[PDB]
Ligand binder design. Structure first.
Ligand code: NI
Lengths: 115, 121
């Protein structure tokens, strides 16, 4: 199964993996639970000179999206990974407006753009 | 055997206008389609943060857009005759250069929509 296949891949890097029909052009979104470290709170710590507490995100994919459908249809393992990774960074970039490794994102993006 | 020809630069300049201080074609030591930079005696990215941190207000850094002539995607853009598609690739690359330089983009969602479409093209 797709969802399980993504959970396996991402392991604990994420709190959970769900499919949301919050239709739009967006293929993926990320969010935190009610009473857990929010991305907004995590930034407050950085802004106060403290190290950023871990944020367990919930990774949600749009099954109606062409890219998510594509991802799911990919048999190859490495390829299937490039997509999940690309979608996760995408959701993360939208959530926090920043990425841990911006260049890695740009690199994997362009790799799927030329292949 | 790297003599790059065409009017690609003029085309990109026309399109970007003053959103950029200038456009150039320079090679890279990586597989990066494009980067952004600042010349000497010019407010750089870090300088800008220092400025703001000092309680000052300053205009957004007008970067120098440097496209990588040997990169597939930069070539694809130059070959695209459709002003729409062209403009789309250029916008994608410029946004990639900013993200890599500033670690952030003014409109992340717009960038994300763009790559998504282009990934499906
Ligand atoms: Ni060359």
């Amino acid at each position: 199964s797709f969802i399980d296949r993504v959970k396996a891949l991402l392991g604990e890097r994420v709190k959970d993996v769900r499919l949301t029909h919050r239709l739009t052009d967006t293929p993926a979104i990320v969010s935190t639970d009610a009473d857990e470290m929010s991305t907004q709170m995590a930034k407050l710590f950085a802004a106060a000179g403290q190290k950023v507490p871990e944020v367990k995100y919930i990774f949600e994919l749009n099954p109606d999206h062409v890219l998510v459908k594509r991802a799911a249809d990919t048999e190859d393992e490495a390829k299937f990974s490039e997509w999940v990774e690309l979608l996760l960074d995408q959701a993360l970039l939208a959530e926090r407006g920043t990425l841990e490794d911006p260049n890695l994102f740009i690199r994997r993006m362009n790799q799927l753009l030329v292949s």
